[PDB]
Amino acid sequence: EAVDQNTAIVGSTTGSNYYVRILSTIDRELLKPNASVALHKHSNALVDVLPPEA
Amino acid sequence: VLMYGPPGCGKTMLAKAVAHHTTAAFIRVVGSEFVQKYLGEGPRMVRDVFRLAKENAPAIIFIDEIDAIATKRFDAQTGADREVQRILLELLNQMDGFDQNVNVKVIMA
Amino acid sequence: RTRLLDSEIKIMKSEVLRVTHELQAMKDKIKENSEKIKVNKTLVSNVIELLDVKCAVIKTSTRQTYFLPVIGLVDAEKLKPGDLVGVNKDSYLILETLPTEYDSRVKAMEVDERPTEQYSDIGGLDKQIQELVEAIVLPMNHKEKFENLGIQPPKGVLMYGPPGTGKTLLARACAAQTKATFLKLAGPQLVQMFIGDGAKLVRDAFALAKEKAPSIIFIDELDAIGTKRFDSEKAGDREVQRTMLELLNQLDGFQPNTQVKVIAATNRVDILDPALLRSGRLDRKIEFPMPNEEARARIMQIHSRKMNVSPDVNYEELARCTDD
Amino acid sequence: AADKQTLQSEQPLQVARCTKIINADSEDPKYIINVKQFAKFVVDLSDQVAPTDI
Amino acid sequence: KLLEHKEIDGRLKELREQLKELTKQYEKSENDLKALQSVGQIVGEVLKQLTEEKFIVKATNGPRYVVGCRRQLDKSKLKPGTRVALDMTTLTIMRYLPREVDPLVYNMSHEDPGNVSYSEIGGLSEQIRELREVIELPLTNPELFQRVGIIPPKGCLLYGPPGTGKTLLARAVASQLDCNFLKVVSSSIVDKYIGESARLIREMFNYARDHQPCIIFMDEIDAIGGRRFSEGTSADREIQRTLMELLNQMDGFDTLHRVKMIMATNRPDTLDPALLRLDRKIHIDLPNEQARLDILKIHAGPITKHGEIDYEAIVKLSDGFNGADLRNVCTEAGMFAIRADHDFVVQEDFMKAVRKVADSKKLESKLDYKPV
Amino acid sequence: ACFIRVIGSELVQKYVGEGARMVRELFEMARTKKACLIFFDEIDAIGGARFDDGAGGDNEVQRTMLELINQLDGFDPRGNIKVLMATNRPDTLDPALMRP
Numbered sequence A: 001e002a003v004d005q006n007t008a009i010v011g012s013t014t015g016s017n018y019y020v021r022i023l024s025t026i027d028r029e030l031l032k033p034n035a036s037v038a039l040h041k042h043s044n045a046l047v048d049v050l051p052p053e054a
Numbered sequence B: 001v002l003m004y005g006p007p008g009c010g011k012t013m014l015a016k017a018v019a020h021h022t023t024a025a026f027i028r029v030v031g032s033e034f035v036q037k038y039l040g041e042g043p044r045m046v047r048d049v050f051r052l053a054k055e056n057a058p059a060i061i062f063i064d065e066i067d068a069i070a071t072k073r074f075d076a077q078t079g080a081d082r083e084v085q086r087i088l089l090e091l092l093n094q095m096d097g098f099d100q101n102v103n104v105k106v107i108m109a
Numbered sequence C: 001r002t003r004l005l006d007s008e009i010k011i012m013k014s015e016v017l018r019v020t021h022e023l024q025a026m027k028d029k030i031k032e033n034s035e036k037i038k039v040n041k042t043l044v045s046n047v048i049e050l051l052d053v054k055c056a057v058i059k060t061s062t063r064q065t066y067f068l069p070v071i072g073l074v075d076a077e078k079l080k081p082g083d084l085v086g087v088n089k090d091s092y093l094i095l096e097t098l099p100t101e102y103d104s105r106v107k108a109m110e111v112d113e114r115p116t117e118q119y120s121d122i123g124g125l126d127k128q129i130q131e132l133v134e135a136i137v138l139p140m141n142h143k144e145k146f147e148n149l150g151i152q153p154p155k156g157v158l159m160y161g162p163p164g165t166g167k168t169l170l171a172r173a174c175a176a177q178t179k180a181t182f183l184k185l186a187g188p189q190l191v192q193m194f195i196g197d198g199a200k201l202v203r204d205a206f207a208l209a210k211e212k213a214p215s216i217i218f219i220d221e222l223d224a225i226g227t228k229r230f231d232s233e234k235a236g237d238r239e240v241q242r243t244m245l246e247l248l249n250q251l252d253g254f255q256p257n258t259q260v261k262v263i264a265a266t267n268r269v270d271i272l273d274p275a276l277l278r279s280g281r282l283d284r285k286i287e288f289p290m291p292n293e294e295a296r297a298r299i300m301q302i303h304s305r306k307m308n309v310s311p312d313v314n315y316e317e318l319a320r321c322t323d324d
Numbered sequence D: 001a002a003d004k005q006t007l008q009s010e011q012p013l014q015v016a017r018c019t020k021i022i023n024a025d026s027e028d029p030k031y032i033i034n035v036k037q038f039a040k041f042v043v044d045l046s047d048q049v050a051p052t053d054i
Numbered sequence E: 001k002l003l004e005h006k007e008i009d010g011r012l013k014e015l016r017e018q019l020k021e022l023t024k025q026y027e028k029s030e031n032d033l034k035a036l037q038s039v040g041q042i043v044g045e046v047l048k049q050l051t052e053e054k055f056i057v058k059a060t061n062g063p064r065y066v067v068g069c070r071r072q073l074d075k076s077k078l079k080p081g082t083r084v085a086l087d088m089t090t091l092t093i094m095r096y097l098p099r100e101v102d103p104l105v106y107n108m109s110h111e112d113p114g115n116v117s118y119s120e121i122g123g124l125s126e127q128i129r130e131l132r133e134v135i136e137l138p139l140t141n142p143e144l145f146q147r148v149g150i151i152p153p154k155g156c157l158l159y160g161p162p163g164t165g166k167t168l169l170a171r172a173v174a175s176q177l178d179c180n181f182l183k184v185v186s187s188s189i190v191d192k193y194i195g196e197s198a199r200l201i202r203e204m205f206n207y208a209r210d211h212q213p214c215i216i217f218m219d220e221i222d223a224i225g226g227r228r229f230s231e232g233t234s235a236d237r238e239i240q241r242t243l244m245e246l247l248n249q250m251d252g253f254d255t256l257h258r259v260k261m262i263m264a265t266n267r268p269d270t271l272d273p274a275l276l277r278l279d280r281k282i283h284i285d286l287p288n289e290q291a292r293l294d295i296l297k298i299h300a301g302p303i304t305k306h307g308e309i310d311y312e313a314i315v316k317l318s319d320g321f322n323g324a325d326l327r328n329v330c331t332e333a334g335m336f337a338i339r340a341d342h343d344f345v346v347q348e349d350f351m352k353a354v355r356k357v358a359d360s361k362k363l364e365s366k367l368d369y370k371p372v
Numbered sequence F: 001a002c003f004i005r006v007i008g009s010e011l012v013q014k015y016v017g018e019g020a021r022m023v024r025e026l027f028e029m030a031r032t033k034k035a036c037l038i039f040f041d042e043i044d045a046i047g048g049a050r051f052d053d054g055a056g057g058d059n060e061v062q063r064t065m066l067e068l069i070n071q072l073d074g075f076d077p078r079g080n081i082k083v084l085m086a087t088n089r090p091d092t093l094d095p096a097l098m099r100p
Ligand SMILES: Nc1ncnc2c1ncn2[C@@H]1O[C@H](COP(=O)(O)OP(=O)(O)OP(O)(O)=S)[C@@H](O)[C@H]1O
Pocket: B005, B006, B007, B008, B009, B010, B011, B012, B013, B014, E151, E247, E248, E250, E251, E252, E274, E275, E277
């Protein structure tokens, strides 16, 4: 879920969902699905989301 | 569609022949792979199968297992309560009646 | 003798080389072995599998995978795929192997109460004395005598007799007179809801017996779940057959090892399968006849000896006036 | 504040979690332990303890 | 007086061996130091190659990430599914490696004890050649099937009384062909869950697909192969499930090249008809007079006996006995001799063993059930 | 005048050796006093034949019962104490309990 501009609560795959900021240049109409987001390890800063997986 | 191969048959062989002459995004599976321990494993399997299927191309996909899998006998409270529950639930909910543009005409035998 | 000077130079060189080996080995070993001990002292995990293209992976106490191209502080032969090893949490190098491939009550199956008892006590079991000795204490120690002749030692015994002739008494006799590896087995303790128990039990016990060659396995009422096979239409469970056939192809089918000491101290053998007695499982099948007339009185006075008795007791009349 | 600083003075010690025992080895006790649920621990004690009070 | 020469020679050779062993040990010590320095390598799994560098992965026991390879892990063969290793620091792929081997396979692939070749147990005189016509026919060479063309079968099925030689037949073939005998018996696959057995079975199929000349042994398929009734217990439904899965695996989609199966059990009648379609039920036939005496001989070679053993006596003393049976006969002969410790063996002891084994036969009943 | 109730049902505890520790507790509290009574029941629920499963579960019973075997009679026997383990049925016995 997104709260504000380029910032969203995002389910993790490690064990702790987080509410992080994202790279703003990402098209705002692309963060709607629970698709394969990608962030930094510690910062957990969203860089982009990938459609496919698994 | 449906087939059934008894002793001295080759019903499956026909399927593989078509699998040759088919030249699109067809995925092969076996319904036996849907029965594990935790919740909805095979159910979620077939769910994501449907998703990726309607995603890539609504061309073709096929699965091969009917016996002991597509079990109309929902009625025995001895064994496979949640197991047969999720099995036949995935079966029917994925029947969807149909979806009319996906995975055209899986068979089984 | 001009070469004596060059020989002395070479000997001083060999002494310096031995001192350099001493340095590089012991001095550096202070550090290296001390770090190894630290990992051992300051603070148990599983091997995954083996490659040498040496190349092994680590399964942790925390259930985590960790490959290494070189194993290091242990030997791959001392290891195998799936081995418990006390390992460096940090380096992920195996330090030592864990030789605890044993379960809790599968290890408790080795008992050590062992109350003492000889063949003199049991009255009416003379042939029992002879054959029990010959097939228990000799396959325990005189394994070569059969090899001297060159055929085989005996392969399993069948202790049968009605309740009041005794067969577990032979278990107690093998316990007292023979001090080999005590490892019991019985019937009721096989009853389980968790389907598939005796398989791993039998496998691990077989390995442990390979470690413990004088492997006495007295299986009282061994016919309990090792039983004649059935054939019906959904009438009967299967896990009994699972463990039974697993033990069949475990003991039989492979692994020739004279360490076998397997006995059935049950009541009847008519319920046993022809798959359970042929020629290598329970070789001899001798009965426990009812104490005939004065064998009964023998057992009786065995009861009637410690407890203080007025010697005005003729056990003959006693045994006679209660026949069968 | 009857003892509101002694509790701030007891602070120099924070050790000794639950740490249940399992078994022990030979040639040195090497008692085996699990802390709460995490793993098995073939430990070597802090020698300022009794080799049998554990 | 060259005492210095030879004395210093001995001292220097001793010090040479000592310093050599100790410096090699110091080298192995620095090597273990490097092994410490060569940190462990977590094993994760690349979920999919997004691009030639962005490999979308998930830790085999953790979260998912996207990293690259070290330098030369040969992405050519590296595709989603293959097992790789990961960097300690950056999780980057440091080394890909062959897939797992699922321990149980080694339990049915590494226990194989080497033993005698294919001439020990009798009664299978004509079977020895029968077994070879399928047992070395593809093993020796399949190029004959380029002249001819016939597609190789997978195996056959045995039967007979329990442990009476079918076990020993398998042992003999194993210790005789000696290539890839996967000694599986499938006795305790289904513990309490559903697809785990079929899962490991699929793994074994893949493993056999790796190497060409694989050999598959399967005795006591009783509670695994079996027959498919209506819905039985949950366990029964699982068994029939894995049955259909095994039956569907037989045909699969791609020919499993150069692998041969060995189906066996005491009661192969238990198998479902949809499964019993195994070129033929080869049998270990009852050793008769000739065969009984042949095995009886072979059980009595290395005895401290003499030219005394009466052959036809034991022959007519018999009512059907296989290699294991007359092995027990010679054994109980040497035992009733060892009763009072006769290091030699007289055929009298053979007859005493005949007594003991005839007493054992009293514990037999209903000794045959025909399959198919 | 001594009667100490210890029911085998409460003795169904889920801590390893805690059962055996209660064994020593009761056995030595009894030996302090005299003419005692200790009443273990539900040995049907406790067990008489040494059932073993690879479940890794009910083995505190194992150690506890071996400790009991050690501490009941012989090794300072009950004497002026009665520690009673009884059943509804002699159904599942063991060659270790028929001892006089
Ligand atoms: N004419 C044939 N030539 C060669 N192989 C054949 C032939 N017919 C059947 N087969 C074998 O059967 C498989 C393909 O036929 P299928 O249709 O799968 O058989 P089926 O009807 O499923 O019968 P089952 O499953 O064995 S009971 C292949 O793996 C072949 O080895």
